[PDB]
Design an enzyme around this catalytic site. Structure first.
Site, PDB file in Angstrom:
ATOM      1  N   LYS A  29     -15.525  -4.771 -12.009  1.00 50.28           N
ATOM      2  CA  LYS A  29     -14.463  -5.512 -12.948  1.00 50.28           C
ATOM      3  C   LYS A  29     -14.196  -6.969 -12.183  1.00 50.28           C
ATOM      4  N   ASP A  30     -14.020  -7.167 -10.661  1.00 54.27           N
ATOM      5  CA  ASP A  30     -13.500  -8.239 -10.085  1.00 54.27           C
ATOM      6  C   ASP A  30     -14.941  -8.975 -10.238  1.00 54.27           C
ATOM      7  N   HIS A  49       1.014  -1.382   0.166  1.00 52.03           N
ATOM      8  CA  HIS A  49      -0.048   0.174  -0.134  1.00 52.03           C
ATOM      9  C   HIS A  49       0.895   1.202   0.034  1.00 52.03           C
ATOM     10  N   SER A 103      -0.722  -0.537  -6.312  1.00 55.69           N
ATOM     11  CA  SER A 103      -0.343  -1.453  -7.294  1.00 55.69           C
ATOM     12  C   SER A 103       0.750  -0.961  -8.556  1.00 55.69           C
ATOM     13  N   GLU A 147       0.701 -33.975  -6.012  1.00 59.80           N
ATOM     14  CA  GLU A 147      -0.490 -33.397  -6.796  1.00 59.80           C
ATOM     15  C   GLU A 147       0.427 -32.581  -7.867  1.00 59.80           C
TER      16      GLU A 147
HETATM   17  C1  HEM Z   1      -3.162 -16.130  -0.662  1.00 60.22           C
HETATM   18  C2  HEM Z   1      -2.316 -15.778  -1.702  1.00 60.22           C
HETATM   19  C3  HEM Z   1      -2.196 -14.512  -2.080  1.00 60.22           C
HETATM   20  C4  HEM Z   1      -3.251 -13.498  -2.041  1.00 60.22           C
HETATM   21  C5  HEM Z   1      -4.789 -13.621  -1.523  1.00 60.22           C
HETATM   22  C6  HEM Z   1      -2.885 -12.313  -2.838  1.00 60.22           C
HETATM   23  C7  HEM Z   1      -3.654 -11.241  -2.942  1.00 60.22           C
HETATM   24  C8  HEM Z   1      -3.314  -9.891  -3.496  1.00 60.22           C
HETATM   25  C9  HEM Z   1      -3.982  -8.991  -4.039  1.00 60.22           C
HETATM   26  C10 HEM Z   1      -5.411  -8.769  -3.651  1.00 60.22           C
HETATM   27  C11 HEM Z   1      -3.112  -8.053  -4.788  1.00 60.22           C
HETATM   28  C12 HEM Z   1      -3.552  -6.697  -5.105  1.00 60.22           C
HETATM   29  C13 HEM Z   1      -4.481  -6.948  -6.483  1.00 60.22           C
HETATM   30  C14 HEM Z   1      -3.413  -7.780  -7.499  1.00 60.22           C
HETATM   31  O1  HEM Z   1      -2.456  -7.036  -8.079  1.00 60.22           O
HETATM   32  O2  HEM Z   1      -3.604  -8.567  -8.147  1.00 60.22           O
HETATM   33  C15 HEM Z   1      -1.869  -8.421  -4.772  1.00 60.22           C
HETATM   34  C16 HEM Z   1      -0.987  -7.919  -5.268  1.00 60.22           C
HETATM   35  C17 HEM Z   1       0.437  -8.507  -5.085  1.00 60.22           C
HETATM   36  N1  HEM Z   1       0.873  -9.890  -4.829  1.00 60.22           N
HETATM   37 FE1  HEM Z   1      -0.346 -11.154  -4.050  1.00 60.22          FE
HETATM   38  N2  HEM Z   1      -1.528 -12.432  -3.252  1.00 60.22           N
HETATM   39  C18 HEM Z   1      -1.310 -13.791  -2.932  1.00 60.22           C
HETATM   40  C19 HEM Z   1      -0.037 -14.342  -3.149  1.00 60.22           C
HETATM   41  C20 HEM Z   1       0.901 -13.946  -3.521  1.00 60.22           C
HETATM   42  C21 HEM Z   1       2.088 -14.408  -3.812  1.00 60.22           C
HETATM   43  C22 HEM Z   1       2.641 -15.806  -3.674  1.00 60.22           C
HETATM   44  C23 HEM Z   1       3.039 -13.380  -4.444  1.00 60.22           C
HETATM   45  C24 HEM Z   1       4.475 -13.631  -4.956  1.00 60.22           C
HETATM   46  C25 HEM Z   1       5.218 -14.740  -5.046  1.00 60.22           C
HETATM   47  C26 HEM Z   1       2.355 -12.054  -4.565  1.00 60.22           C
HETATM   48  C27 HEM Z   1       3.028 -11.067  -4.691  1.00 60.22           C
HETATM   49  C28 HEM Z   1       2.093 -10.071  -4.853  1.00 60.22           C
HETATM   50  C29 HEM Z   1       2.930  -8.645  -5.808  1.00 60.22           C
HETATM   51  C30 HEM Z   1       4.032  -8.213  -5.860  1.00 60.22           C
HETATM   52  C31 HEM Z   1       1.602  -7.840  -5.734  1.00 60.22           C
HETATM   53  C32 HEM Z   1       1.706  -6.471  -6.195  1.00 60.22           C
HETATM   54  C33 HEM Z   1       1.455  -6.593  -7.693  1.00 60.22           C
HETATM   55  C34 HEM Z   1       1.272  -5.249  -8.393  1.00 60.22           C
HETATM   56  O3  HEM Z   1       0.055  -4.721  -8.150  1.00 60.22           O
HETATM   57  O4  HEM Z   1       2.041  -4.916  -9.050  1.00 60.22           O
HETATM   58  N3  HEM Z   1       1.065 -12.295  -3.823  1.00 60.22           N
HETATM   59  N4  HEM Z   1      -2.103  -9.783  -4.019  1.00 60.22           N
HETATM   60  C1  HEM Z   2      -5.544 -22.706   1.728  1.00 64.95           C
HETATM   61  C2  HEM Z   2      -6.256 -23.422   2.398  1.00 64.95           C
HETATM   62  C3  HEM Z   2      -6.454 -24.599   2.354  1.00 64.95           C
HETATM   63  C4  HEM Z   2      -5.942 -25.666   1.227  1.00 64.95           C
HETATM   64  C5  HEM Z   2      -5.116 -25.287  -0.132  1.00 64.95           C
HETATM   65  C6  HEM Z   2      -6.431 -27.027   1.566  1.00 64.95           C
HETATM   66  C7  HEM Z   2      -5.993 -28.054   1.094  1.00 64.95           C
HETATM   67  C8  HEM Z   2      -6.678 -29.326   1.240  1.00 64.95           C
HETATM   68  C9  HEM Z   2      -6.299 -30.662   0.244  1.00 64.95           C
HETATM   69  C10 HEM Z   2      -5.419 -30.369  -1.004  1.00 64.95           C
HETATM   70  C11 HEM Z   2      -6.759 -31.434   1.126  1.00 64.95           C
HETATM   71  C12 HEM Z   2      -6.909 -32.684   0.588  1.00 64.95           C
HETATM   72  C13 HEM Z   2      -8.508 -32.947  -0.279  1.00 64.95           C
HETATM   73  C14 HEM Z   2      -9.067 -34.075  -0.896  1.00 64.95           C
HETATM   74  O1  HEM Z   2      -8.363 -34.656  -1.758  1.00 64.95           O
HETATM   75  O2  HEM Z   2      -9.998 -34.755  -0.344  1.00 64.95           O
HETATM   76  C15 HEM Z   2      -7.811 -30.830   2.120  1.00 64.95           C
HETATM   77  C16 HEM Z   2      -8.347 -31.799   2.930  1.00 64.95           C
HETATM   78  C17 HEM Z   2      -8.807 -31.297   4.336  1.00 64.95           C
HETATM   79  N1  HEM Z   2      -8.942 -29.890   4.634  1.00 64.95           N
HETATM   80 FE1  HEM Z   2      -8.089 -28.520   3.494  1.00 64.95          FE
HETATM   81  N2  HEM Z   2      -7.247 -26.904   2.775  1.00 64.95           N
HETATM   82  C18 HEM Z   2      -7.183 -25.563   3.007  1.00 64.95           C
HETATM   83  C19 HEM Z   2      -7.970 -25.073   4.431  1.00 64.95           C
HETATM   84  C20 HEM Z   2      -8.466 -25.884   5.124  1.00 64.95           C
HETATM   85  C21 HEM Z   2      -8.943 -25.401   6.329  1.00 64.95           C
HETATM   86  C22 HEM Z   2      -9.074 -23.805   6.888  1.00 64.95           C
HETATM   87  C23 HEM Z   2      -9.500 -26.368   7.053  1.00 64.95           C
HETATM   88  C24 HEM Z   2     -10.225 -26.084   8.435  1.00 64.95           C
HETATM   89  C25 HEM Z   2      -9.857 -27.312   9.014  1.00 64.95           C
HETATM   90  C26 HEM Z   2      -9.212 -27.616   6.124  1.00 64.95           C
HETATM   91  C27 HEM Z   2      -9.667 -28.845   6.496  1.00 64.95           C
HETATM   92  C28 HEM Z   2      -9.513 -30.001   5.889  1.00 64.95           C
HETATM   93  C29 HEM Z   2     -10.027 -31.214   6.076  1.00 64.95           C
HETATM   94  C30 HEM Z   2     -10.587 -31.665   7.366  1.00 64.95           C
HETATM   95  C31 HEM Z   2      -9.692 -32.081   5.058  1.00 64.95           C
HETATM   96  C32 HEM Z   2      -9.856 -33.589   4.972  1.00 64.95           C
HETATM   97  C33 HEM Z   2     -11.133 -33.968   4.369  1.00 64.95           C
HETATM   98  C34 HEM Z   2     -10.940 -34.176   2.908  1.00 64.95           C
HETATM   99  O3  HEM Z   2     -10.003 -34.615   2.604  1.00 64.95           O
HETATM  100  O4  HEM Z   2     -11.849 -33.480   2.363  1.00 64.95           O
HETATM  101  N3  HEM Z   2      -8.600 -27.155   5.185  1.00 64.95           N
HETATM  102  N4  HEM Z   2      -7.150 -29.618   2.225  1.00 64.95           N
HETATM  103  C1  LIG Z   3      -8.364  -5.964   1.906  1.00 69.90           C
HETATM  104  C2  LIG Z   3      -9.148  -6.484   3.099  1.00 69.90           C
HETATM  105  C3  LIG Z   3      -9.827  -5.513   3.833  1.00 69.90           C
HETATM  106  C4  LIG Z   3      -9.548  -4.842   5.343  1.00 69.90           C
HETATM  107  C5  LIG Z   3      -8.384  -3.942   4.949  1.00 69.90           C
HETATM  108  C6  LIG Z   3      -7.222  -4.400   5.798  1.00 69.90           C
HETATM  109  C7  LIG Z   3      -7.207  -4.229   7.165  1.00 69.90           C
HETATM  110  C8  LIG Z   3      -5.799  -3.915   7.596  1.00 69.90           C
HETATM  111  C9  LIG Z   3      -5.622  -2.200   7.137  1.00 69.90           C
HETATM  112  C10 LIG Z   3      -4.960  -1.378   8.099  1.00 69.90           C
HETATM  113  C11 LIG Z   3      -3.278  -1.605   8.006  1.00 69.90           C
HETATM  114  C12 LIG Z   3      -3.034   0.133   8.098  1.00 69.90           C
HETATM  115  O1  LIG Z   3      -3.248   0.308   6.726  1.00 69.90           O
HETATM  116  C13 LIG Z   3      -3.097   1.901   6.662  1.00 69.90           C
HETATM  117  O2  LIG Z   3      -4.252   2.504   7.029  1.00 69.90           O
HETATM  118  C14 LIG Z   3      -4.305   3.946   6.784  1.00 69.90           C
HETATM  119  C15 LIG Z   3      -5.661   4.354   7.265  1.00 69.90           C
HETATM  120  O3  LIG Z   3      -6.555   3.347   7.380  1.00 69.90           O
HETATM  121  C16 LIG Z   3      -3.911   4.269   5.197  1.00 69.90           C
HETATM  122  O4  LIG Z   3      -3.848   5.663   5.250  1.00 69.90           O
HETATM  123  C17 LIG Z   3      -4.377   6.297   3.903  1.00 69.90           C
HETATM  124  O5  LIG Z   3      -5.658   6.539   4.002  1.00 69.90           O
HETATM  125  C18 LIG Z   3      -5.934   7.972   4.846  1.00 69.90           C
HETATM  126  C19 LIG Z   3      -7.625   8.015   4.329  1.00 69.90           C
HETATM  127  O6  LIG Z   3      -8.127   7.035   4.007  1.00 69.90           O
HETATM  128  C20 LIG Z   3      -5.054   9.029   4.871  1.00 69.90           C
HETATM  129  O7  LIG Z   3      -5.096   9.589   6.201  1.00 69.90           O
HETATM  130  C21 LIG Z   3      -3.519   8.545   4.335  1.00 69.90           C
HETATM  131  O8  LIG Z   3      -2.967   9.746   4.023  1.00 69.90           O
HETATM  132  C22 LIG Z   3      -3.404   7.667   3.582  1.00 69.90           C
HETATM  133  O9  LIG Z   3      -2.097   6.994   3.687  1.00 69.90           O
HETATM  134  C23 LIG Z   3      -2.653   3.681   5.041  1.00 69.90           C
HETATM  135  O10 LIG Z   3      -2.438   3.799   3.661  1.00 69.90           O
HETATM  136  C24 LIG Z   3      -2.913   2.054   5.250  1.00 69.90           C
HETATM  137  O11 LIG Z   3      -1.584   1.696   4.977  1.00 69.90           O
END
Ligand code: HEM
Ligand code: HEM
Ligand SMILES: CCCCCCCCCCCCO[C@@H]1O[C@H](CO)[C@@H](O[C@H]2O[C@H](CO)[C@@H](O)[C@H](O)[C@H]2O)[C@H](O)[C@H]1O
Ligand SMILES: CCCCCCCCCCCCCCCCCC(=O)OC[C@H](COP(=O)([O-])OCC(O)COP(=O)([O-])OC[C@@H](COC(=O)CCCCCCCCCCCCCCCCC)OC(=O)CCCCCCCCCCCCCCCCC)OC(=O)CCCCCCCCCCCCCCCCC
Ligand SMILES: CCCCCCCCCCCCCCCCCC(=O)OC[C@H](COP(=O)([O-])OCC[N+](C)(C)C)OC(=O)CCCCCCCCCCCCCCCCC
Ligand SMILES: CCCCCCCCCCCCCCCCCC(=O)OC[C@H](COP(=O)([O-])OCC[N+](C)(C)C)OC(=O)CCCCCCCCCCCCCCCCC
Ligand SMILES: CCCCCCCCCCCCCCCCCCCC(=O)O[C@H](COC(=O)CCCCCCCCCCCCCC)COP(=O)(O)OCCN
Ligand SMILES: CCCCCCCCCCCCCCCCCCCC(=O)O[C@H](COC(=O)CCCCCCCCCCCCCC)COP(=O)(O)OCCN
Ligand code: HEC
Ligand SMILES: CCCCCCCCCCCCO[C@@H]1O[C@H](CO)[C@@H](O[C@H]2O[C@H](CO)[C@@H](O)[C@H](O)[C@H]2O)[C@H](O)[C@H]1O
Lengths: 244, 56, 383, 85, 124, 71, 54
Positions: free
Chosen positions: C228-229, C202, C206, C272
């Site tokens: 758009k999302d 932040h 982006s 996998e």
């Molecule tokens: C749970 C997995 C992740 C979530 C939920 C997540 C979510 C996001 C989101 C919402 C943004 C801002 C919107 C976007 O650009 O698409 C973002 C930006 C970014 N993410 Fe992730 N991300 C994840 C994993 C990763 C991983 C594995 C990497 C790097 C290896 C990564 C690197 C970044 C970077 C560098 C940005 C900034 C990109 C830019 O706007 O130019 N994230 N991520």
């Molecule tokens: C990033 C989040 C997660 C990923 C990538 C993930 C991935 C997986 C995978 C690959 C399996 C094997 C599924 C199958 O072939 O049957 C699995 C099984 C399972 N996961 Fe997760 N999991 C996630 C989050 C969670 C969370 C938060 C829970 C809370 C307990 C959970 C509970 C389970 C359970 C109970 C199973 C065994 C039952 C089954 O195979 O369906 N998982 N998960």
């Molecule tokens: C994406 C999931 C949605 C939940 C949001 C994530 C929760 C955690 C966010 C808080 C972490 C602190 O994040 C920080 O917050 C302050 C105010 O909120 C922001 O501050 C920004 O916005 C405020 C007004 O909107 C301005 O006063 C400031 O000039 C600007 O920098 C920072 O840019 C951000 O980095």
């Protein structure tokens, strides 16, 4: 690996349930249960299926209760704590032919016949593999194949030598619906039945999927219209630059 | 014109309507996992004898 | 002052989802971040629900998963949603990482979100590996055995560490119960790191597909990127629907429907699909410890992209040679994936080694050379 | 490197007039058919080589490797397999 | 890499007759395929700016150059989001692709690098 | 009788005749080779599995749909 | 159009009420429509089609 080590790949047969909108044929499921009961159940269990599971799929409540009530199951001990038996109930699981693995192997020259409740998901090919295997015992093994003792040649089975002999022959079953019980017909019915046993949610799942597809597609279309509507002021923006 | 605005709100409204119907379906089907499973519902209807039971 | 700005809690949400200033020209590859957040929410909802019906004891685990499939209302859906969303999570994460590499999102001033991103990717791998073991089918057991035995390569203490991880002398009940506890925990850790990388982002905002500043031309996150999302959310849900309802087992291995049997070894023990490229890299090195180091290095080497990219320009949109190199790098990564699941046979043994060399040489040789030369071509070419 | 609304960190802007019209006043799908055909064709044509060359190369490599592997594990490939191991 | 580095290496090439004979035509083709001119950019508009040195160089641009750069960035952003290319006078012609920023950044960097050297002087 | 018996026979004599011949030739060779003495102390014993697979794969391609149509 | 806008759309309370009521109607009618269509394309195959024999 050699093709023999993999096993020959089964044909893709046109099953009634193939088809995004297609259910199982329940008449085939019922016939397949009868093949299971009269042929496979001598060696193979179906332990994940309870009598209640047949009801409204292949049989009525009364037919299934009749099947359950003919068997004896372990009851809770009596008042002196001695073991007792009771007749089966719909909640009971279909009982297997052998008490343990050791007994199963002893009856099958060392081989252990798998439980068939998940077999259609536990093998590549599913129904096609079961159908191909059951109908694919050649009269004679290809010249040069040496079978280990108690093995039978079947090209669909990896390595070729399977411990299960051919079991389906024309007229081993007499179907109750008058269908000719040929090898092919019985293999098709039992493969359908076993597919149902592996995935009993199949019919409901695909119908729910149709509803989801329709709703999600409409939402996708509307989301495109709405995004374009909201973005049009940005896309349509124009500039006039007059350098200061 | 009102017709022009009404059309765009028909699209927004339809989208809101399918999102409401989809959320309802999702929530209902998903949460039903917490209601008694089939094996639990199969354990009702207990049958009890009466011959063994003495008077008093 | 508007409440959304005045109240400190609301203002935090406001800063990330509503008033957040975004570039006006993000393309559809900027939508994978919200799809990853969606996958995470689906996995939490389905995962916690499966936890209500699953039993972690080795005598009951596989059967508790059958009970979910057969008896729990909509259990089949919750199970298949959880299993398929694990694959979708990796497709979205590879797309998000590929976006980041193509557009130079790892360059200053975004080194910190990228580096925390690399850790998110490692936590996702661990989470998914442990969850796969929970089924306690044949692939569950044998995959746990071979992957956990890689730790035996750690010098001196490696064997002791493995026994400590297993809680015994082989993969068994203690290992399954601890994998359940950790599989439940790890997604919460992953959510915290996902939040950290966004807070780190932040400060710069982006990046955008042109690689230039967007400070000249910002759009609010809402309503533009909210709407758009939704398009990609519904596109994702359509793909989800086709797998979960029409082909729920396409992405799986049939052997995981056979209960774990420590005696019988399956024909082929493969991870996998999403772990396959790293497995191919490991096979390429003949030494055990060498292979483990290479496999870990293949992920940690992402941390050096900020250094080895010598370009004065951010991203590949205007760099034809970099674009070709990136294309070859991506396709090589897919070929490594394929080679991870072939048999260890000719000629795939040597091919796997060549693809491994290409993978590493992208970071160490090609990207530094190509980015150096392109700097000079931009300068000379525009004089 | 990014500020916030009112102090985003832009160099001073002067001399640009910007114009746009309401979403309710515009046709959101204006020119969609031309875009869908001609714009997509232009954008795809200009990026085609960067996809085709690596995809076609790596697919050829795979095809040759998979065909050789298949042949080595036939009867005909016995001798060549013996050498390869 | 520093702009200083890029400029010095380029000058070594432009000096060598052989090298220039083979590099200059390649660089011109590279620039044509790069296609930044089709979004109305000048080459220097693409240089990464989120750096202390570059922020200082941009602050030293004459106001006119600064206002025009802002317009080219906004215009290119609008082409990018619309998925269109420049036409007509918006296309940057080769003679308009001037290195307006290079002299400013080379001066900023000269001082920065001299400061680094002089921080490491050793009285003899 | 089993509809498959006739369908398979028809497919072997018809569209899969080339494969049928190869299998036949192979079996002739292998049987003859087994007949010869000091076969048991040979390094390489040929089978006919490959040729069999080629034939069966071919029969199945020409029969699968036809067979299921008459069940 | 003015009338329709004024009654169902202008007030967000009315708009949301109309959307929710429509969602209720859609949900019930779509259920019935899919059920019938599903039964027609899978005719003779389902338990309900063979149940009468037993
Ligand atoms: C749970 C997995 C992740 C979530 C939920 C997540 C979510 C996001 C989101 C919402 C943004 C801002 C919107 C976007 O650009 O698409 C973002 C930006 C970014 N993410 Fe992730 N991300 C994840 C994993 C990763 C991983 C594995 C990497 C790097 C290896 C990564 C690197 C970044 C970077 C560098 C940005 C900034 C990109 C830019 O706007 O130019 N994230 N991520
Ligand atoms: C990033 C989040 C997660 C990923 C990538 C993930 C991935 C997986 C995978 C690959 C399996 C094997 C599924 C199958 O072939 O049957 C699995 C099984 C399972 N996961 Fe997760 N999991 C996630 C989050 C969670 C969370 C938060 C829970 C809370 C307990 C959970 C509970 C389970 C359970 C109970 C199973 C065994 C039952 C089954 O195979 O369906 N998982 N998960
Ligand atoms: C994406 C999931 C949605 C939940 C949001 C994530 C929760 C955690 C966010 C808080 C972490 C602190 O994040 C920080 O917050 C302050 C105010 O909120 C922001 O501050 C920004 O916005 C405020 C007004 O909107 C301005 O006063 C400031 O000039 C600007 O920098 C920072 O840019 C951000 O980095
Ligand atoms: C999984 C979960 C489901 C969710 C799906 C989300 C995926 C959406 C996404 O990111 O890609 C859409 C994305 C469209 O996104 P966009 O925002 O219109 O343009 C992004 C590109 O930068 C714009 O690229 P461009 O403008 O240069 O156009 C190039 C594109 C044409 O792109 C068009 O859509 C036209 O055509 C090709 O590159 C095809 C290559 C030639 C093959 C022959 O499709 C591509 O352009 C894919 C090209 C990748 C190679
Ligand atoms: C997922 C749940 C969907 C709930 C739908 C209930 C109605 C809300 C809706 O669709 O948006 C209409 C409303 C308003 O959409 P709107 O902002 O286009 O309408 C305002 C302008 N008038 C009232 C003149 C039409 O959305 C909301 O109030 C937010 C709820 C989002 C869902
Ligand atoms: C497969 C090989 C892909 C090579 C891409 C080459 C560029 C191209 O044609 O893409 C179209 C577009 C070109 O977009 P662009 O932003 O460069 O150009 C837009 C148009 N101009 C130049 C006029 C401004 O590229 C993308 O959108 C690239 C995103 C990359 C995502 C990669 C996912 C792979 C996952 C593996 C992870 C490790
Ligand atoms: C968690 C995973 C999320 C993915 C959702 C996809 C479908 C899940 C719902 C089950 C289903 O198949 O619903 C069908 C209708 O499709 C639909 O209408 C559902 C498609 C809608 C997808 C997106 C809508 C909201 C999703 C999440 C919102 C969360 C908020 C509250 C839960 C069947 O219909 P039925 O007959 O089974 O229905 C009962 C009332 N008639
Ligand atoms: C099922 C999932 C989608 C359901 C919600 C969509 C909204 C339904 C219609 C409501 C609507 O269009 O009205 C707007 C509400 O949208 C909103 O306020 C939200 C806009 C988009 C909804 C979700 C945003 C997604 C972005 C990130 C995805 C994250 C995935 C991770 C889990 C307000 O319209 P207006 O506010 O423009 O003004 C207009 C004047 N009031
Ligand atoms: C009297 C013994 C016997 C009968 C009858 C029998 N089987 Fe088997 N079956 C076995 C044995 C033993 C194996 C284990 C074979 C092996 O693994 O070598 C087996 C294995 C199988 C397999 C698994 C092959 C594999 O891929 O591992 C399937 C599927 C199968 N049987 C289905 C059936 C069906 C369907 C029927 C009858 C309609 C049937 N069986 C009848 C003894 C029998
Ligand atoms: C945000 C939460 C607010 C509180 C909401 C409370 C939701 C919890 C209620 C669970 C209700 C389940 O209600 C029950 O659902 C199932 C679907 O799930 C329906 O079941 C119906 O459709 C399903 C498929 O969707 C078929 O498998 C079934 O044969 C059919 O009868 C029942 O007709 C209904 O009685």
């Amino acid at each position: 690996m050699t093709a023999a080590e993999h096993g020959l790949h089964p044909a893709e047969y046109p099953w009634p349930q193939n088809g995004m909108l297609s259910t199982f044929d329940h008449a085939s499921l019922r016939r397949g249960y009868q093949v299971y009961k009269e042929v496979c159940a001598a060696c193979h269990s179906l332990d994940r299926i309870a009598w209640r599971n047949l009801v409204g799929v292949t049989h009525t409540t009364d037919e299934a209760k009749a099947f359950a009530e003919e068997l004896e199951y372990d009851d809770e001990p009596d008042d002196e704590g001695n073991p007792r038996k009771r007749p089966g109930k719909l909640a009971d699981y279909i009982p297997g032919p052998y008490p343990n693995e050791q007994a199963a192997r002893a009856a099958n020259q060392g081989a252990l016949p798998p439980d068939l409740s998940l077999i259609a998901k536990a093998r590549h090919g599913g129904a096609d593999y079961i159908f191909a295997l059951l109908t694919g015992y050649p009269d004679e093994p290809p010249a040069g194949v040496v079978l280990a003792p108690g093995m039978n040649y079947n090209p669909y089975f990896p390595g070729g030598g399977i411990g299960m002999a051919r079991t389906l022959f024309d007229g081993v079953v007499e179907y109750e619906d008058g269908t000719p019980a040929t090898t092919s017909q019985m293999a098709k019915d039992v493969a359908a039945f076993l597919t149902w046993a592996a995935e009993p949610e199949h019919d409901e799942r695909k119908k729910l999927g149709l509803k989801a597809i329709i709703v999600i597609s409409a939402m996708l279309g509307l989301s495109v219209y709405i995004k374009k509507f909201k973005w049009s002021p940005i896309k349509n923006r124009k500039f006039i630059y007059n350098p200061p | 014109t009102d017709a022009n605005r009404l059309f765009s709100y028909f699209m927004i409204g339809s989208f809101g309507m399918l999102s409401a119907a989809g959320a309802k379906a999702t929530v209902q089907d998903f949460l039903s996992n917490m209601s008694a499973s089939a094996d639990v519902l199969a354990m009702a209807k207990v049958e009890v004898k009466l011959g063994a039971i003495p008077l008093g | 002052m508007a409440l959304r700005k005045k109240n400190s809690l609301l203002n935090m949400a406001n800063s990330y989802v509503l008033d957040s200033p975004q570039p006006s020209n993000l393309n559809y590859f900027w939508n994978f971040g919200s799809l990853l957040a969606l996958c995470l929410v689906i996995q939490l909802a389905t995962g916690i629900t499966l936890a209500m019906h699953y039993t972690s004891h080795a005598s009951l685990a596989f059967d508790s998963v059958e009970h979910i499939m057969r008896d729990v209302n909509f259990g089949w859906f919750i199970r298949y949603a959880h299993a398929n969303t694990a694959s979708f999570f990796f497709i979205c994460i590879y797309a998000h990482m590929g976006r980041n590499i193509y557009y130079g999102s790892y360059k200053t001033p975004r080194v910190l979100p990228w580096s925390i991103g690399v850790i998110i990717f490692l936590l996702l791998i661990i989470t998914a590996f442990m969850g796969y073991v929970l089924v306690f089918g044949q692939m569950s057991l044998w995959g746990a055995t071979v992957i956990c035995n890689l730790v035996s390569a750690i010098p001196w203490l490696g064997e002791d560490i493995v026994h400590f991880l297993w809680g015994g002398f082989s993969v068994g009940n203690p290992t399954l119960q601890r994998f359940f506890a950790l599989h439940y925990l790890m997604p919460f850790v992953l959510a915290v790191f996902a939040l950290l990388h966004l807070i780190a982002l932040h400060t710069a905002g982006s990046s955008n597909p042109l690689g230039i500043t967007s400070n000249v031309d910002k759009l609010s996150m809402h309503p533009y990127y909210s709407f758009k999302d939704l398009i990609t959310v519904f596109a994702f849900l359509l793909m989800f629907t086709l797998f979960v309802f029409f082909s729920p087992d396409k992405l799986g291995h049939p052997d995981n429907y056979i209960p774990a049997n420590p005696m019988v070894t399956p024909a082929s023990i493969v991870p996998e699909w999403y772990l396959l490229p790293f497995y191919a890299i490991l096979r390429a090195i003949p030494d055990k410890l060498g292979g483990v180091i290479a496999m870990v290095a293949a992920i940690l080497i992402l941390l050096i992209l900020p250094i080895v990219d010598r370009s004065i320009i951010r991203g590949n949109a205007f760099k034809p040679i970099s674009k070709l190199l990136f294309g070859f790098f991506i396709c090589n990564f897919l070929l490594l994936g394929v080679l991870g699941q072939v048999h260890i046979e000719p000629p795939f043994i040597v091919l796997g080694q060549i693809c491994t060399i290409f993978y590493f040489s992208y970071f160490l040789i090609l990207l530094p050379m190509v980015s150096t030369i392109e700097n000079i071509f931009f300068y000379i070419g525009s004089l | 490197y990014m500020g916030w609304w009112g102090h985003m960190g832009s160099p001073p802007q002067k001399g640009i007039a910007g114009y746009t019209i309401s979403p309710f006043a515009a046709r959101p799908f204006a020119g969609v058919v031309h875009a869908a055909i001609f714009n997509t064709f232009r954008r795809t044509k200009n990026q085609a080589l960067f996809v085709i060359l690596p995809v076609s190369f790596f697919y050829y490599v795979w095809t040759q490797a998979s065909e050789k592997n298949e042949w080595l594990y036939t009867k005909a490939g016995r001798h060549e397999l013996a050498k390869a191991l | 890499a520093s702009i200083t580095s890029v400029v010095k290496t380029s000058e070594l090439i432009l000096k060598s007759p052989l090298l220039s004979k083979i590099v200059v035509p390649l660089a011109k083709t590279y620039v044509k395929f790069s296609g930044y001119r089709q979004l109305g950019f000048k080459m220097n508009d693409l240089i990464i700016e989120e750096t202390p040195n570059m922020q200082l160089a941009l602050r030293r641009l004459p106001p006119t150059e600064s206002y025009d750069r802002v317009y080219r960035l906004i215009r290119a952003t609008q082409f990018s989001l619309s998925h269109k290319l420049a036409t007509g006078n918006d296309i940057t012609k080769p003679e308009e692709d001037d290195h307006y920023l290079i002299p400013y950044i080379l001066d900023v960097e000269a001082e920065a690098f001299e400061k680094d050297a002089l921080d490491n002087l050793e009285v003899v | 009788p089993d509809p498959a018996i006739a369908l398979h026979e028809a497919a072997a004599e018809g569209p899969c005749h080339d494969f049928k011949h190869h299998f036949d030739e192979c079996v002739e060779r292998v049987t003859k080779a087994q007949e010869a003495e000091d076969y048991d102390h040979a390094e390489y014993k040929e089978d006919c599995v490959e040729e069999f697979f080629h034939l069966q794969h071919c029969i199945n391609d020409n029969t699968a749909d036809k067979l299921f149509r008459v069940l | 159009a003015t009338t329709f806008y004024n009654v169902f759309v202008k007030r967000n309370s009315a708009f949301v009420a109309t959307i929710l009521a429509s969602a209720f109607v859609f949900d019930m009618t779509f259920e019935t429509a899919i059920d019938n269509f599903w039964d027609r394309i899978n005719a003779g195959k389902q338990w309900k089609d063979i149940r009468h024999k037993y």
